[PDB]
Design a protein around this ligand. Structure first.
Ligand SMILES: Nc1ncnc2c1ncn2[C@@H]1O[C@H](COP(=O)(O)OP(=O)(O)OP(=O)(O)O)[C@@H](O)[C@H]1O
Ligand SMILES: Nc1ncnc2c1ncn2[C@@H]1O[C@H](COP(=O)(O)OP(=O)(O)OP(=O)(O)O)[C@@H](O)[C@H]1O
Ligand SMILES: [Mg+2]
Ligand SMILES: [Mg+2]
Lengths: 157, 157
């Protein structure tokens, strides 16, 4: 099959969950998946706990991440370090799916060059499906995507 | 850029020429191109004469090719041999463009499995543009293509 680019955006809950439900499906089907999480949570990683042991590679942003205006140099460096792994996955012919969780924020805060993103996506192995998640996804990424689902919060607990 | 699939079909003259005019443009621009010609001509290869010395790989069907109903086994084997090279080009991340000249006939006469074609096209490096030429291109290849130009013979000398 031809790999496509899927985007889960919107303010409603379920973006990251949709992405990992997709990765789970793929894993359940014997496909190879790699994941990059651009935002580190203070909590234990259930998804990772589940998937990782199946051989799924996970790449998480370093704990140092500040978001502080004063620390942009250091933060951007960490962002770039993690992205290096992503670029690698986006170039691996053997990876059926790549999940780029909370990548929208990286672009929205300029910690990752858009151009670099469009390039790596455009140049990925043909059968490779990429899932991108995050609120406020950049319009140029949305245009490149094959499917864009916007999670509209009709209600939230 | 994202590689696309271009198809030059129709009964009008200019299919092979359009494809090689495209390859020339690409070469003139420093891009890497590879070519497979599914039909061997009795004449000296001008395109090849021109391009080949620029490093362009050319793969031509063996001279043995018969089209004879009695020889399908041997013919299909030769077809498959040449296609092996094509599949390789369609998997090379460093090839910006791949030309599959007269490939339509290979599928139309069942010397090459359609499925194999759709697969290799679908799985090619993302920035890879493929040009397919030939009269009566299979509908399933036409559907996969991004641009399909049909050469309508309004007149022919
Ligand atoms: N509208 C909302 N208000 C408050 N918290 C939310 C809202 N939407 C999602 N969350 C939660 O905030 C955290 C960050 O989630 P994010 O903004 O990335 O949403 P999400 O990816 O759609 O959430 P989830 O991981 O549950 O699918 C999550 O724990 C998430 O469950
Ligand atoms: N309608 C036609 N009648 C006769 N000869 C034709 C016609 N169209 C093309 N030709 C010639 O027949 C040979 C096979 O060409 P083919 O059917 O593959 O056309 P083509 O690829 O469009 O031609 P060209 O290589 O000139 O671009 C060529 O030498 C070609 O120039
Ligand atoms: Mg999320
Ligand atoms: Mg021709």
């Amino acid at each position: 099959e031809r790999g496509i680019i899927i985007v889960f955006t919107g303010n409603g809950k379920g973006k990251t969950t949709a992405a990992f439900g997709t990765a789970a499906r793929a894993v359940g089907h014997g496909k190879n998946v790699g994941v990059v999480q651009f935002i580190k949570g203070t909590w234990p990683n259930g998804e990772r706990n589940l998937l990782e042991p199946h051989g799924v590679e996970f790449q998480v942003m370093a704990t140092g991440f500040t978001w502080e205006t004063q620390n942009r140099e250091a933060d951007t460096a960490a962002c770039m370090a993690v992205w290096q792994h992503g670029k690698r996955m986006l170039a691996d012919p053997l990876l059926d799916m790549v999940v780029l969780d909370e990548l929208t924020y990286m672009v929205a805060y300029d910690y990752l060059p858009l151009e670099e993103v469009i390039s790596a996506l455009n140049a990925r192995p043909g059968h490779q499906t990429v899932i991108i998640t995050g609120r406020g996804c950049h319009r140029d990424i949305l245009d490149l995507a094959d499917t864009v689902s916007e999670l509209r919060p009709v209600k939230h607990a």
